């Protein structure tokens, strides 16, 4: 059964609701982004209209084999009419193709669904600018003040400088970056760029990246592993055993591995600054966990909501426990009282 927080009232619409069979009364299914918790259920056999961004539509067609006749891509920042209701897609600052959705209900109510997002001040100058929003369906992933992390720019600076130092000291070092979904591409692209290398990867991962409309991508990625000194592997292989195994396969080209795991928040954010981060090392392998987030920090989320001043907030993450729900509700009230809405 489809949960209430995936339904848009006064419409025939659901958001990220593909794992519940045929949802009674749903005339159009929206998909915010191509992450598996959100697309779970879509396949070549899906025969209802799916509304999404162009990038998301490319991934549906080529990775899930959804038939073209049911994929309805919409341009960003453009008023569109869907089944008699005005909608707008906005960039979510999450992974490639991820959007927020504005719904203008026939009765005058305005609803913003953030999908997954990393709130940014730049959103305060989109089409949201002087738009009254009555209901906000909010990505509350990190809705607690302990969740701090650096800017994406600071984390990339650390990664570039770390990789460049290591490989300039040892030209026979290989760099490895973990991945398990789309998103966080800047990590491996920025490192390859500083090293003057293409990024080497599996055919399956290459296929995925070719769907993302990234400028000059043919110049940056390859399936020829032998030509590359930056390799991408599944996140599950980024451990001492898995990396030792990989090094064996490279045929004595390399004698050291520097590897990166781009996590979200971890407990070491409560203690350490990005400049001070150190790896776990065993012999000729080192592994850095770097806090590259594609979700709002607590402070970023707070600033967005206090700027927007919604009348009602509906959380879409951490909704399964009474303790989480009570904690989030207490922060929303704090934010409202501080800002005066
Ligand atoms: C930053 N943002 C906050 C929310 N917001 C309103 O609540 C609002 C109030 C009054 C009018 C009158 C026309 N449009 C309006 C929008 C728009 C500005
Ligand atoms: Ni996501």
Where exactly are the structural domains of the chain?
1-147+296-341, 148-295
Tokens linked to 53: 């961004």
The values of phi and psi at residue 37, to 5°, are -65, -25
Judged by phi (left if over 0) then psi (alpha if -120 to 50, else beta), residue 194 lies in: alpha
Q: What dihedral angle (degrees, nearest 10) is formed by the CA atoms of 75, 87, 119, 186?
A: -20
Phi and psi at 80, nearest 5°, equal: -125, 150
Residues 6+ positions from 86 with CB-CB distance below 8 Å: 79, 80, 103, 104
Residues 89 and 177: their CA atoms lie apart, in Å, by: 31
Q: Which tokens go with 216?
A: 């000059």
Decide: 231 and 201 in contact? Cβ < 8 Å: yes
- Say what angle helices 298-308 and 322-339 make with each other, to 10 degrees: 50
As a residue count, the chain comes to 341
Nearest-angstrom CA–CA distance, 223 and 216: 16
Determine how many CB atoms are found less than 10 A away from the CB of residue 330: 10
| Residue with token string 């193709």 | 97
Is the CB of residue 141 less than 8 Å from the CB of residue 225? no
For residues 273-311, b (16+ Cβ closer than 10 Å) or e, as one string? Answer: ebeebeeeeeeebbbbbbbbbbbbbbebbbbbbeebebe
Closest-CA residue to 32 (of 108, 110, 112): 112
* Dihedral over alpha carbons 289, 294, 300, 303 (to 10 degrees): -170
Q: Choose which residue among 309, 335, 336 to substitute to test ligand 1 binding: the one with the highest number of ligand atoms within 8 A of its C-beta.
A: 309
33 CA to middle of ligand 2, Å? Answer: 7
Q: Is 3.10.50.40 the CATH classification of the domain at 1-147+296-341?
A: no
Pocket test for ligand 1, best of 125, 127, 131, 312 (most atoms within 8 A of CB): 131
**Ligand 1 proximity of 341 Cβ (cutoff 6 Å):** no
Q: Report the largest interatomic distance among the alpha carbons of the chain, rounded to a whole angstrom.
A: 68
Any atom of ligand 1 within 6 Å of the Cβ of 241: no
Q: Ligand 1 centroid vs 133 CA: distance in angstroms?
A: 8
Q: How far apart are the CA of 102 and the centre of ligand 1, in A? A: 15
127 lines ligand 1 (CB under 6 A): no
Pocket of ligand 1 contains residue 130 by CB under 6 Å: yes
d(CA 6, CA 33): 14
Dist. CA 298–CA 82, nearest whole Å: 34
Tokens 């990775």 — which residue? 63
Cross-strand partners of 221: 199
CATH code for the structural domain at 148-295: 3.40.50.12650
From the CB of 132, is ligand 1 less than 6 Å away? Answer: yes
| 78 Cβ neighbours under 8 A, 6+ residues apart | 88, 89
Alpha-carbon Rg of the chain, whole angstroms? 22
What DSSP element (H or E) covers 7? strand 7-8
Strands (E) in 49-196, as ranges, are 50-52, 71-73, 80-82, 85-91, 99-104, 110-113, 135-138, 173-179
Q: Whose CA is nearest to atom 15 of ligand 1?
A: 132
Nearest ligand to the CA of 181 is 2
Question: CA 31 to CA 59: how far, in whole Å?
Answer: 12
Distances (CA, A) of 305 to 18, 109, 120, 243, 302: 28, 18, 11, 43, 5
238 vs 148: CA distance, rounded Å: 24
Q: Which of 108, 121, 132, 341 to mutate to test the pocket of ligand 1 (most atoms within 8 A of CB)?
A: 132
Ion ligand 2 neighbours (CB, 5 A) are 35, 116
Backbone breaks in the chain after residues (C–N over 2.5 Å): none
- Two tokens, residue 206: 């290459």
Nearest residue (by CA) to ligand 1, atom 7, is: 132
Tell me how the structure was determined.
X-ray
Are 117 and 92 within 8 A, CB to CB? yes
Sheet architecture: strand order including 285-291? 221-222, 199-200, 230-234, 173-179, 256-263, 285-291, 280-282
Give the number of other Cβ atoms within 10 Å of residue 98's Cβ.
Answer: 28
Nearest CA to ligand 1 atom 9: 132
CB of 276 sitting under 6 A from ligand 1? no
CA of 83 to the centre of ligand 1 (A): 27
- Alpha-carbon gap, residue 127 to 131, rounded angstroms: 7
Q: Phi and psi for 125 in degrees, rounded to 5? A: -120, 20
The backbone torsions φ and ψ at residue 325, rounded to the nearest 5 degrees and listed phi first, read -60, -45
Q: Give the sign of the dihedral formed by CA 186, CA 51, CA 81, CA 69.
A: positive
DSSP per-residue string spanning 219-230 = GTEES-GGG-SE
Q: N- to C-terminal Cα distance for the chain?
A: 35
Which two tokens mark 99?
A: 């959007």
The finding on whether 309 has its CB within 6 A of some atom of ligand 1 is yes
Topology match between the domains 1-147+296-341 and 148-295: no
Distance of CA 290 to the CA centre of its chain: 16
Q: Are 271 and 299 in contact (CB under 8 A)?
A: no
Q: How far apart are CA 23 and CA 132, in angstroms?
A: 30
Residue 100 · residue 82 · CB < 8 Å: no
Ligand 1 within 6 A of 307 CB? Answer: yes
Q: How far apart are CA 274 and CA 300, in angstroms?
A: 18
């Amino acid at each position: 059964t489809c949960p209430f927080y995936k339904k848009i009232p006064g419409t025939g619409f659901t958001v990220d609701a593909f794992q519940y069979g045929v949802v009674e009364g749903c005339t159009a299914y929206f998909l915010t982004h191509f992450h598996s918790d959100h697309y779970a259920g879509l396949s070549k056999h899906f025969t209802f209209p799916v509304y999404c961004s162009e990038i998301t539509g490319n991934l549906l067609k080529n990775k899930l084999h959804v038939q073209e006749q049911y994929i309805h891509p919409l341009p960003l920042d453009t008023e569109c009419i869907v089944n008699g209701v005005k909608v707008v897609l906005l960039d979510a600052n999450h992974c490639p193709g991820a959007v927020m959705i504005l719904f203008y209900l026939p009765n005058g109510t305005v609803i913003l669904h953030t999908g997954d997002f990393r709130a940014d001040p730049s959103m305060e100058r989109s089409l949201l600018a002087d738009q009254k929003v009555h209901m906000l369906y909010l990505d509350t992933t990190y809705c607690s003040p302990e969740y701090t992390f650096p800017s994406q720019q600071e984390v990339i600076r650390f990664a570039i400088n770390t990789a460049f130092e290591a490989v300039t000291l040892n030209p026979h070092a290989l760099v490895v970056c973990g991945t398990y979904s789309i998103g966080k591409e800047k990590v491996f692209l920025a490192i390859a760029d500083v090293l003057g290398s293409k990024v080497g990867m599996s055919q399956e991962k290459y296929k995925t990246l070719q769907c993302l409309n990234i400028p000059e991508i043919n110049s940056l990625i390859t399936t020829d592993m032998c030509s590359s000194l930056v390799h991408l592997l599944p996140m599950m292989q980024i451990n001492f055993k898995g990396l030792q195994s990989h090094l064996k396969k490279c045929g004595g080209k390399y004698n050291q591995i520097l590897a990166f795991r781009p996590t979200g928040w971890t407990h070491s954010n409560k203690f350490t600054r990005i400049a001070d981060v150190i790896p776990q090392t065993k012999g000729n392998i080192s592994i850095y966990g770097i806090p590259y987030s594609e979700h709002s920090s607590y402070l970023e989320m707070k600033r967005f909501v206090q700027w927007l001043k919604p009348q009602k907030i509906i959380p879409t993450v951490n909704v399964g426990t009474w303790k989480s729900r009570s904690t989030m509700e207490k922060y929303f009230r704090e934010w409202k009282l501080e800002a005066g809405y």
